[PDB]
Amino acid sequence: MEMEKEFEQIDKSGSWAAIYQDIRHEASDFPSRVAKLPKNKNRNRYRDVSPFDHSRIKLHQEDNDYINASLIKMEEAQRSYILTQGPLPNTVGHFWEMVWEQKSRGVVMLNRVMEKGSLKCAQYWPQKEEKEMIFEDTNLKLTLISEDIKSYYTVRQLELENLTTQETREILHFHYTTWPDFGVPESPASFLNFLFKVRESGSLSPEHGPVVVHCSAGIGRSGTFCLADTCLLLMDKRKDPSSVDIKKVLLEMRKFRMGLIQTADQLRFSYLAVIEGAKFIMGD
Ligand SMILES: CS(=O)(=O)N1C[C@H](O)[C@H]2C[C@@H]1CC[C@H]2O
Ligand SMILES: CS(=O)(=O)N1C[C@H](O)[C@H]2C[C@@H]1CC[C@H]2O
Numbered sequence: 001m002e003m004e005k006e007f008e009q010i011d012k013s014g015s016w017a018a019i020y021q022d023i024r025h026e027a028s029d030f031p032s033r034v035a036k037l038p039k040n041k042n043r044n045r046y047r048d049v050s051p052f053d054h055s056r057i058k059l060h061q062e063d064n065d066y067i068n069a070s071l072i073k074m075e076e077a078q079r080s081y082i083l084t085q086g087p088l089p090n091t092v093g094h095f096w097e098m099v100w101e102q103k104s105r106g107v108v109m110l111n112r113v114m115e116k117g118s119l120k121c122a123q124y125w126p127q128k129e130e131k132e133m134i135f136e137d138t139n140l141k142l143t144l145i146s147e148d149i150k151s152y153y154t155v156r157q158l159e160l161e162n163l164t165t166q167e168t169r170e171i172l173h174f175h176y177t178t179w180p181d182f183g184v185p186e187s188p189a190s191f192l193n194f195l196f197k198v199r200e201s202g203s204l205s206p207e208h209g210p211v212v213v214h215c216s217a218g219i220g221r222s223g224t225f226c227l228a229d230t231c232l233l234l235m236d237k238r239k240d241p242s243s244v245d246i247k248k249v250l251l252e253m254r255k256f257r258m259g260l261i262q263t264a265d266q267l268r269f270s271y272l273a274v275i276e277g278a279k280f281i282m283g284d
Pocket of ligand 2: 075076077234243244245246248249252
C-alpha cells in the first residue's frame, strides 16, 4: 500500500502495536559473540543491545578492537551510517578513535547528557574553547572551535588532532536538544529541519566517511533518523515514489543492527516524518 493512506488505515484501526510486533518477529537474528566476551562488559551500556559480529566497527588496535557500533550500509540509497551507543566513561577515547579511523565528518547526537534525572551518556566533548580534552588511551586532542545554539538544536565546530601524527580535522557536532523525556515529538517539523541541516553540511555525502549517530542505546531515536533519511532519498531516486515501503526499509536496516525503532510510537512518528518530508522536498 501507499504510505499516507496505510497510515490513516492504521490510525483508524488502532493497530500500531500489532504492526510493530510483526516487525519484531520478522527481524534478523545474527551472532554478537565479540560483544558478549567478558573483557568487553564495561564497553556496553545495556546488556540487551549489542552489535552483530558481521557489521560491527573494528578499532585499529591489536589489544582490543571492540566498540558498541554498527555499519548500516544502504545499497540502493547509496548512504551509509554508523549507529553507536552514547559513550561511557571508559569508552570516550574509543569513540573519537572510531571517528578518526572511519574518516567521519559529522556526529549526530539525539539525547541530552541527563534525561529523567539519570546520566544517558558521558560529557564527551569540551564545553569551553580554552578547556580542551586529551584522551590519553587513544592519543587524541579535541578542541571546541565554535558553538551555535538554536531553539531546537545546537551545532558545534570541533577540531580533532591525532597527536601521533599531528594531523588535524574539522568535525561537525549536530545536537538535537528537544526530544521529550517521554514519548515522541507531537510534530515532525523540527526533526525534519534538523535532518536537512545535517544534509546541507556535507556530513552525509560520499566524499566523507559515514556519519556517526547516537542516542543512549543507539537504536531508537537513532533508528528514526536514518530510516527517515533513507526513505526520503529513495522517494527522490525512484520513478514511482509510492513504491517506497517503510516497513521493508526498516527490516533491511535491522540486518545490520538489532532493535532499530524501540516502540510503536517511534514507528508511527517515522511514518509521519517521511510523509511530511516528502511534501516539502517538492511533492505537495
Ligand atoms: C493504539 S495503537 O496501537 O494504535 N497505538 C497508537 C496509539 O496512538 C498509542 C498507543 C498505541 C501504540 C502507540 C501509541 O501511539
Ligand atoms: C523496495 S523499497 O524501496 O522499499 N526498498 C529497496 C531498497 O533498495 C532497499 C530496502 C527496500 C527493499 C530492499 C532494498 O533494495
